Amino acid sequence: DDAAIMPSIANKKILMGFWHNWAAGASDGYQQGQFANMNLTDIPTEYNVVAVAFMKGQGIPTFKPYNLSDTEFRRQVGVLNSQGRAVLISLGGADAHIELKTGDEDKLKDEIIRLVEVYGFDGLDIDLEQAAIGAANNKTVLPAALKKVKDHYAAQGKNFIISMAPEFPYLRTNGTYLDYINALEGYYDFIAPQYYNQGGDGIWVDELNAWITQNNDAMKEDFLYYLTESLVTGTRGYAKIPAAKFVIGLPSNNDAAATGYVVNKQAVYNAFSRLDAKNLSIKGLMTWSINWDNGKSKAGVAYNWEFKTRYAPLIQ
């Protein structure tokens, strides 16, 4: 039963991407482009962590493939798992109506385990929208349910992966989101903050006497390096996340996010080598999204896996 395997992502860097569980409209992109619809088995093998978007819903959130039978979806997850590639279910996204109630910890654990058994998922990504981070009892019920799920699979010899994809400004000192990170200390495998869609947010870098915003293309390398350094050291107004458990999240192209797209690939290569030189090597890259990475612009130009082609060599 290949889908039953939970691939290990230890001892290597990852190239993680999100896969959309809904059909493309005519112009969903931030520049009116269109994303590609595809099977999981159409995803380039270089994407070794695929996060399925999204588990959502009032009461106990859930997930069902929008266009594949459960059997066929599990078969495809099994193909990826046979290749050593992990497939996570991502809880959240826009308009998810996630409002967990105290007392629903075991019901949420049971539904996560059901999704693993039905679809072959290897873990869960937390991608809550801003309205959900402090909603209802999400703060306590979600970490409690996940610890139970992790413990359940660890008893079977399996590592159920837990990841989080916070907007980067969620991670400043005294941030309400830090409660999730602290509650899951020793349970989460990595945190992949979104270095996009917050164009006006920035950091003051004394080393350059410069204010660098997330929408500054001229200084993109320094934005990637210094926001990462701040996050993995707990400086410049940010709380600390261990570098070995840290992943930089980027838009695959300008249709995938309003701002944040890295125009010059060398900015990423250099940010990584600079972190490596300071013994701050990180876990890899995440992108929104795989469907966008093979989509097309408004003018019909194919993105043709630009993100995967630019950065897979860095990861492997």
d(Cα 137, Cα 1) in Å, to the nearest integer?
36
Least distance in angstroms from the C-beta of 192 to Ca ion = 20
Q: Judged by CB under 5 A, which of 105, 122, 127, 222 binds Ca ion?
A: 122
Site pattern 269..288 for Ca ion (x: CB under 5 A): --------------------
Q: Which two tokens stand for residue 146?
A: 């996940």
- In whole angstroms, how close is the CB of 73 to Ca ion at the nearest point? 12
Question: Smallest distance, Å, CB 97 to Ca ion?
Answer: 27
Residue 103 annotated as lining a ligand binding site: no
- What is the spatial distance between Cα 159 and Cα 51, in angstroms, rounded to a whole number? 16
Q: Are strands 161-164 and 123-128 parallel, antiparallel or unpaired?
A: parallel
Please answer whether residues 118 and 45 qualify as being in contact, where contact means their C-beta atoms are separated by less than 8 angstroms.
Answer: no
What residues act catalytically? Answer: 129
The CB-of-158 to Ca ion minimum distance in angstroms stands at 8
Are 130 and 94 in contact by the 8 Å Cβ rule? The answer is no
Residue 176: other Cβ atoms inside 10 A: 10
Cβ proximity to Ca ion: between 95 and 151 the closer is 151
> Are the CB atoms for 164 and 207 separated by under 8 Å?
no
Determine whether the annotation assigns residue 5 to a binding site: yes
Interaction between residue 255 and Ca ion (CB under 5 A): no
**Burial track 154-175 (b if 16+ CB lie within 10 A, e otherwise):** eeeebbbbbbbbbbbbbbbeeb
Q: Which is nearer to Ca ion, 41 or 273 (CB)?
A: 41
CB closer to Ca ion out of 120 and 166: 120
DSSP 153: H
Query: Is 33 within any annotated ligand binding site?
Result: no
Residue 295, interface with Ca ion (CB under 5 A)?
A: no
Residue ranges in 68-87 that form contacts with Ca ion under rule CB under 5 A: 81
Q: Is 59 helix (H, G, I), strand (E, B) or coil?
A: coil
Residues that contact Ca ion, how many (by CB under 5 A):
4
- Shortest Å, Cβ 8 to Ca ion: 11
Query: What is the C-alpha to C-alpha distance for residues 151 and 36, in angstroms, rounded to an integer?
Result: 37
Q: Please check if 120 is assigned to a binding site.
A: yes
- Which residue's CB is nearer to Ca ion, number 42 or number 117? 117
Q: Which of 29, 93, 120, 123 binds Ca ion (CB under 5 A)?
A: 120
CB of 50 or CB of 171, closer to Ca ion: 50
241 is in an annotated binding site: no
Give the sheet arrangement for strand 86-93, strand by strand: 190-191, 161-164, 123-128, 86-93, 49-55, 14-20, 284-288, 247-251
Tell me which amino acid residue 294 is: N
DSSP bridge partners of 285: 15, 248
For Ca ion, which stretch binds (CB under 5 A), given 39-47, 112-120, 140-148, 214-222?
A: 112-120
The binding site consists of: 3, 5, 81, 120, 122
Which residues contact Ca ion by CB under 5 A? 3, 81, 120, 122
The binding site for Ca(2+) consists of 3, 5, 81, 120, 122
